[PDB]
Amino acid sequence: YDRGVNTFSPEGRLFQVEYAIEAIKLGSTAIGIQTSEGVCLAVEKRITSPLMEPSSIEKIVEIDAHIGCAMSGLIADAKTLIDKARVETQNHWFTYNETMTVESVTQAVSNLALQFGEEDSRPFGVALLFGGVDEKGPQLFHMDPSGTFVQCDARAIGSASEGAQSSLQEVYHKSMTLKEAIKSSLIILKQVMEEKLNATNIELATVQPGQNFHMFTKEELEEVIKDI
Template structure:
């Protein structure tokens, strides 16, 4: 069946032989208990197991880099996401294009994941990886709230995500996300990637178009901007990235993280922004 074929393919890439579906595999150190069978492990939807005695990192690295490998899972990733802090909170701006190599698969991807009313996450890299692990983070944040009767801090949420994905380092995950929120200490902005790296800062841009976005952000960003100036900066940076980067495009989704929680400010097609800026430029020339 197709399901069995998928299991055999996954087992082959991971570097172990699928000879007996009742073979036992232990969990990696992510807090789960029990010893599932391989059949159960490959069907689980909320966590992953690591097979005992198999070097998954080496097997996947060989599958992806060996010229003789028959595994064709090399993906080109393209997007532009950004976030920056200023005096009134944090601005998050993203594009909405999804690509598969040279093909544009969608122009309406939602690249901001609303973890809870006070936390946002962005998507860059593999869409499935970002969506899955940030949903796992959302569940863990909710569990924290129920246990402690208060919201989790932005620092703790980002550290939790970094710790979770670090357990799968070298196993083919592709994720570059920004965790944005507001807690007792005020606005917070962190960058987390699939290697478990975690950075705190005032300004980040992630994706294939980030070099163009940084060109606008670095030259224009100020701490004392007004809300309107901050909104325009976020839109302008994403627009310029989509104008130069073929893997970015669609619409600009703009969010504002405030003390009262996040608010979606606008959703603007980059074509409309282009004609708006063109009209302004032509007006200045006259």
């Protein structure tokens, strides 16, 4: 009874979506931290080849001009979720002349991830981190293949997910600043990855209230790493 999305267990449960949570584990790590000054975000690349072009590997995509994103797990299912998440923020501005809030973005995203066998296919294999600054300030959210949606203050997913969480709960507090949280985030990264941390293994993305631009760092990232 463990090969069907249309079949329960004697105890609970699935037994199909539980296997979809396991598909996240073989991804790459990603850390996002919510701070009152804004939301920073970090990820690991895992570049395989030197001939492999680096900017064709995306981990941070721009959903909107005040909302970033992060992903892990299956790359093939991720590009489907990013597509409508750009469209649903665009349909909302067309009919309301306003920016869709960061919480209500994922409401539209979770409404299709819970449609895998509930029409009249398989569940997805990708967890997502959504950071953005809406009218309620900076926000940071998190979802899963099971459509379970929640708000987090600082979250780390992918591979090395549980090992990051124990060290990440140690140093977080409410009165952080943005420039403190950036250098606090990649102390965790060089302790959980196996290669030496340089300017080519990672990439950053921030968002601020008055600086809704710049969900990327372009070789100012070299300044942060050299002062670790």
